[PDB]
Ligand SMILES: CCN(CCC(=O)O)C(=O)c1cccs1
């Protein structure tokens with residue numbers, strides 16, 4: 001089997017991407033944020049505290065003939081941005097892009113933090129990291145990908161995110177029309193439960209490539225590219241008037257600037273992030289200071305190849321017995 005779904009930016013900055021997901025019978029379609037940095041499939045629901053729901057579409061298990069309470073199971077998650085959610089668990093049928101899993105754990109939110117409530121466009125998350133990170137207790141649950149894997153034509157999914165445009169998540173096959181050149185594969189460590197890999201270095205603009213190992217994770221649920229402070233300082237030093245502001249919480253730059261590209265290494269391959277991808281616009285409406293898309297990881301504890309990096313590439317998440325990541329230009 002295979003599945004193929006379109007993923008759409010939630011706003012004009014590509015702050016996140018939403019993908020429609022069918023849950024239950026008859027189908028309830030919710031727009032979920034597919035997150036390769038977490039392992040819970042959780043939704044706004046009929047159980048969510050009413051004051052914490054503001055425009056989201058909710059899952060109502062009582063209206064699904066295939067929903068069953070997973071008796072005694074609870075969940076609670078905290079993300080790297082400080083947001084959180086918790087609740088109870090149902091099993092139900094879940095379909096993405098024509099690919100169906102029966103018996104998927106659907107984590108129903110009773111509580112969500114303010115950042116979720118305030119984002120009316122995101123109805124929940126679909127985690128695509130390793131199932132070792134799933135927060136359901138006392139019985140940990142599998143991701144949608146881990147439940148689909150054995151049925152797929154090939155044990156893979158691919159992320160093809162757009163710059164200010166829709167893109168695609170495919171399950172079970174590699175669309176050889178979706179990228180240019182060849183795919184370069186690289187090793188993954190699952191020791192922390194993430195798609196963790198090692199980049200072979202970087203370049204700023206037309207500058208020379210610096211060969212240096214940069215461990216990090218491939219995380220579709222993180223907007224920006226978070227790298228070591230040395231690398232980030234070398235990038236922003238090429239932009240007149242750029243600086244780190246602790247008042248704004250990251251690198252800012254004059255909106256009048258033209259930004260240089262940023263290249264990262266995948267083995268001998270190179271992925272080039274155009275300068276425009278690194279512009280996240282005004283720090284507040286009407287401001288002439290703009291927020292940078294490459295930020296320091298020094299206050300995180302991990303480097304994160306978020307959407308700014310991933311949407312420059314066709315990315316293969318290979319869940320074979322020995323997992324790998326693949327990257328290609330497009
Ligand atoms: C021999 C290089 N090479 C493949 C790179 C390519 O895909 O061309 C590798 O070492 C791999 C190790 C782990 C996954 S692939």
Ligand code: NA
Pocket residue numbers: none
């Ligand atoms: Na922000």
